[PDB]
Design a binder for this molecule. Structure first.
Ligand SMILES: *Cc1c(COP(=O)(O)O)cnc(C)c1O
Ligand SMILES: *Cc1c(COP(=O)(O)O)cnc(C)c1O
Ligand SMILES: *Cc1c(COP(=O)(O)O)cnc(C)c1O
Ligand SMILES: *Cc1c(COP(=O)(O)O)cnc(C)c1O
Lengths: 450, 450, 450, 449
């Protein structure tokens, strides 16, 4: 009799009065029985409230808002496999159009066969790894042509994102990172060259440093590499990590020469899901030409009577993000992207100007299109003590749901603590003004409770 | 006033009467201006009709259907970044629970500290690469402990999926793939041993061969490695590529000893988005214990007052797939997965039995849970010419929307042409009956057209 | 021409690239012009993120979750006017049914004419004011019957909610609120009698004290009032403020005699939107019989050829909440309400037990259905200093989005600080465990920072 | 049998189910839980017995809301208006509205940047708040003069029922000037005749419900000025602008009815009437801090500070105020003017067309300078077209229209009038359908006794 009465309750009980929702969710072993689908969904939906409100997460560089058409395109493509070119041929075609468009945006030389050399990825990490492998292979071929050993490769870079550290570790390459230091939180030409030698597989400038938000300019570095070859005969290539800058500079600062306009730039990577406005799960890596991508790294697959070259670390994955990316390209175009990015810079500039009035801060990034990305980065003026640290301010802001990271820089600037505010699409002026209000209140509090 | 007149039309024109929809979509350069969002969506939505219907794609192993709750969870998580453990802490916690559940499902030794060693990935490709890197590292340590050189590593395997070829290429490991041959379309104990030597970083049995759908049983191979170490002193580990098998056997054939129950198995990988029932973009790799995973490959990140180890190639990416995976685990449990997988095997078995009476066929896979995955694989009997090849049949079926692949096997069986039908969730008996009807019709046509 | 180009942009610009979203929302003067409706919605939608997550708000007693059918009924009733009985006659009829059901739930004498004496209200506040006006009127009639003056009315009560202070102020009644004091945080029989006199219009027990979560039991007070009349000839009525308790005890503690089973109780009020499970905007007040409600306070209106009595402060208002309330009565019934409330009590008891293990606490409320509502209320043991105050704990929990109030009691217990956690529908066990985890984490932090 | 019935409970269709084979409970709390789809279906269905809101021409309240308001309301279904610290932005948004409405009514610019006023569930609560403040200011005046305060009275014209309730609930003698032939409102002469030192204030109705016409505060204000000059008695006003408050500012700005008038200490209006907000939104604004007795305000902590609160209700939905703010930003003066102009155009059209159909005498014809967008008429005195307006109202109801016909009060109880309200959502084309049914109804009433 109990079984039937229990089952009756299973059918009729409300979501929160149900027996199945009276226990803590499994966290150690694979569940034994099936359960009400509404209760399973409810529990998980509710647990996710413990994640931070994405729109208030001012620490991330990734998109936290997508328009309705992208939501639809994503749902519609939830089961389209990006890797199966023959099974989802139009998704594949759309992908190839994006490759052309991004290559064009970065001034890659026009492809004679009508198709640029490059590929979509899950993000900049995979894109960078692909660029790094190609870089390492081109170096090997150069050394082999010279009759020199290829067992001690190194890579020269500045304050790179962690993915390059993983590349170095995973592909056994010695990472030679020029450390940040007071006065120059980036890789300068002089220190770059001092780290270069015949075993350097390449140099990686970060066109939009994550820690500060400022651009490392490839041109001055390119000049130094030209002189290095003239003096030593050593020819070093560049791969630009433009995770953020790749989808900013072309629109608001087109005259900064950082891309394929520079001879030594053999490849560039960027995150479509950062300022490229695509939903999480989209990255891009373009090569200046076929010569820049070693064929031994490319796996060809049948496609519409012919073949297409593939270079990826991942295999199966959703094609929704690239479809969404194409949508943004067509819907916004240069005009639309410029308007959206200009909106972010205006917000960044506004906040930097207003926050400067509230305390003894020294700004590292103030939302200037010509210097970096739409971000605000600052620190307390040396020797100044307003009665609080940027860590305390970060915490107070969190009480209102905002995630504004405060952290120490690296290298020779480990004693410097900075606060960074990322101004992405969806962080409109009105919304940013609310942050400003909370910022003033927080300081107000820290003042009444020193 | 033509500018005012064009604008009026731009505002009032219907979807297909609009001037902006009168041209072919851009495919070579980045668009210059923005356009109506409905038109951009319509064009792309319509182009996607050229992709094959996913529900009729019987070539793929990946999920082509997800329940409504998964669609909701995915939409809700479109902007949750899997990599930001501190910003989306509960998404991170849910992921850690799945790691424990998958490890438990595969009989991994119980975690003393309550947390299994493993990670979520975009798919089995990344999971296999993580497993391979760890294998390579353990091998180098083993060689180094005996003062031996580590410049000639090789990996022994059978008819593996392409990701293993990419692993060998990207990490400079010699792939010793034992080829399929008549009467033996798998890596057998004897040939495996012939291929193994002091430079073998490990053996990778494929617990669910893509080309045939059959399991390569680790147990017999394991006994062979034990004897190998006894005779030569060479101790070789195994990594199971259970992309499909990992979420099948545990439910429908629990007595098959293929997992951590086997001492030499140091890691196992599988695709959540294949038989794990997760939406595209979910993979898993678990290690036996801490000793199985070299700490040098792990990058720790801050997490709730402590630190969490991370081992991944990708960085930013959506957390929706793992959240959906946890939902399936809780909603279905062993009971639910058993019922779902059983339905797939029932369909495969049905098709195999029905197709067998329509022609002179020899089956390689008939949907037997004790032999492999829910698939049907067959070829024309040796020396039989029914007046058509399986290529013709595959083509006829495509006229009704079905994608049923016909292909030649590799290795020393390149003369053999086989047809494979994958029976996934969402390919119910009634739907399969329709395929059967189209099969009978196709054969009649081929008959009336020798 | 500039106007044409501006118009083109107003039409084609994306949500965040639009000019109209580049400024701060008006807050001082009525706007002059119209603007894109999507921008207006976006700005407001985004500002609301600054409100606390209702599901994590553990301070409120009101519903923070409604099932899909309620969301539908509310949307369908958004334009139905509760006050227009003749224009929306069935909404009116449904409302009258709820009056009957609530009256019956509280053991009101069965209405001979089939319709209980009572009315729906926006909340307990209006309900309490209606009950208060009626009490005042009956008192005046009693005094007048003996030829005595009615210029000095007073109301006797314990730690009441603010609405009674407002009633006293708005209707010129001296509020004799018996203060909380160490050992008895409630109105006890002895002090109640001390405060009562010929000028007392009635006694108001709070069946579910907001500050502690405990019930003030009407029966012992009723016994005292009986003896009081016997000793002094002064006959005093009771009005039970059962804002919370009215939809709890009837289901989980039917043996508690607090309602119309007690002769002196002439009216009872409760919040439908608290434990009554109705969405915000629903309250109830029921009178014992016609004699308990002075007709001079009732305004009759035409209804279906007859007349219905109305007693309300508000006039026009949505009928969705009462329609939703009826749906909950029908869908859940006594069985459903019992299970939902049982779930809340289960959660309160769990947290009480677990939190007790974390520090030197003295509990005031532990979620016992025989003592009060599903709440947890505690203070630090007298003389114990764990290194932090409950205010500190409340603040740290807020860093995770939780709103757990810490406050000082009133009256003679102003030096006592307590923390109160409300366990409502939608605060399931699994969700509560997450809170407990943050509680443990918050304590560890407070210890690591003496 | 247990298992048998359970199987049916799981598989039965909505209408084949056992639980829907009986009449819904109406006497006692149901005992058992039941299928949620059946419970919903039953209620959804009996609600069809309510009149179609879009065809309800008797109500002044909104019967249509745009998609964004529907969304905002669903999103705010659980946001508690009263918990200022818990839903701080909802509260902030509310305060912006207070400023905007105060500005709309020419309230003196607040030096501290925040107007004195509050959102309410409707005009009823707003009027009661204004009434209490009015009563308290009067008490303070009498106490200063050293006179008794036990006999307060309130002077008004044909007020809505809420003022009768205020009078009863707060023990104030209501001195209502009755309507009479040719004067369906409170005129200056009769107002003054009812005023004395016990009058707590005067309440002009800027948009009389029964007729749709405005009672103009200016001439009444002039009479009160003269009254003080003559007697020394200083009487203030509270304008009940339930309807007019969100009409005149947009279509007839030159009418001086608001804070431009010195004696107007407070004004109330229904956001859910012509303010275009969904049901459950009212407003009351005071001209300054001095007009609102502090003894009536309960301060609550708010963002490190305190905010004064004056309300009868406590917990309630914040959706309506959020929706109200959306309309303010989305429409602005331009938008409201366009929306209100549309209603007046429809009211004027119907008045003109209905005039051609019978011997009617119009009381209201949708003129922006005279009142709200309504049509009100009666049969010419001594004229008998063979039917009453009651019969006409009934026949229109056969098509789903609710067009009320009723008798006026006071000295005009023998007068029967019909009133048509033209709100947002009663577009020209829709109104033309009503006109077609009106013509048909008359034609029918003609071929019959
Ligand atoms: C499909 C498959 C893979 C690749 O897994 P993804 O999820 O597509 O990256 C690897 N191994 C085997 C045996 C497979 O079937
Ligand atoms: C964010 C970032 C990355 C990693 O890109 P993903 O899209 O997260 O994989 C790499 N480099 C830089 C400079 C970045 O900012
Ligand atoms: C919450 C509460 C009230 C006020 O009820 P509302 O529904 O918010 O108006 C009154 N009394 C008690 C005891 C309460 O808890
Ligand atoms: C409708 C009305 C009221 C009552 O306002 P509610 O919003 O329904 O509470 C008061 N006065 C007048 C003049 C009205 O028209």
């Amino acid at each position: 009799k109990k079984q039937v009465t229990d089952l009756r309750s299973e059918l009729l009980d409300s979501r929160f009065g149900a027996k199945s929702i009276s226990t803590i969710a499994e966290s150690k072993r694979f569940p034994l029985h099936e359960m009400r689908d509404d209760v399973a969904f409810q529990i998980i939906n509710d647990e996710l409230y413990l994640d931070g409100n994405a729109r208030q997460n001012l620490a991330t560089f990734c998109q936290t808002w997508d328009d309705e058409n992208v939501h639809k395109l994503m749902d519609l493509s939830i089961n389209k496999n990006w890797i199966d070119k023959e099974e989802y041929p139009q998704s594949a075609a759309i992908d190839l159009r994006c490759v052309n468009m991004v290559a064009d945006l970065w001034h890659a030389p026009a492809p004679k066969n009508g198709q640029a050399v490059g590929t979509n990825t899950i993000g900049s990490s995979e894109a960078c790894m692909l660029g790094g492998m190609a870089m390492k292979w081109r170096w090997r071929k150069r050394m082999e042509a010279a009759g020199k050993p290829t067992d001690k490769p190194n890579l020269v870079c500045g304050p790179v994102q962690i993915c390059w550290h993983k590349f170095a570790r995973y592909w056994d390459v010695e990472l030679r990172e020029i450390p940040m230091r007071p006065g120059q939180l980036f890789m300068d030409p002089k220190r770059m060259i001092e780290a270069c030698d015949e075993n350097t597989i390449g140099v990686v400038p970060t066109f939009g440093v994550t820690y500060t938000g400022n651009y490392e300019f490839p041109q001055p570095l390119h000049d130094a590499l030209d002189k290095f070859q003239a003096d030593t005969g050593i020819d070093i290539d560049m791969h630009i990590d433009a995770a953020s800058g790749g989808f900013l500079a072309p629109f608001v600062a087109p005259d900064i020469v950082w891309d394929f306009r520079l001879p030594r730039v053999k490849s560039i990577s960027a995150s479509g899901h950062k300022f490229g406005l695509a939903p999480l799960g989209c990255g891009w890596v373009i090569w200046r030409d076929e010569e820049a991508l070693p064929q031994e790294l490319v796996f060809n697959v049948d496609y519409l009577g012919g073949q297409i070259g593939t270079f990826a670390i991942n295999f199966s994955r959703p094609a929704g993000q690239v479809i969404a990316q194409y949508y943004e390209f067509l819907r916004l175009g240069r005009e639309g992207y410029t308007k959206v990015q200009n909106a972010s810079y205006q917000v960044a500039a506004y906040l930097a100007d207003e926050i400067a009035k509230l305390g003894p801060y020294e700004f590292i990034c103030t939302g200037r299109p010509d210097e970096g990305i739409p971000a605000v980065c600052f620190k307390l003026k040396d020797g100044e003590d307003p009665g609080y640290t940027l860590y305390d301010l970060s915490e107070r802001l969190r009480l209102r749901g905002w995630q504004v990271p405060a952290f120490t820089l690296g290298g020779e600037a480990t004693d410097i603590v900075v606060m960074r505010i990322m101004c992405r699409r969806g962080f409109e002026m009105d919304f940013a003004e609310l942050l400003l209000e909370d910022y003033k209140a927080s300081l107000k509090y820290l003042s009444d409770h020193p």
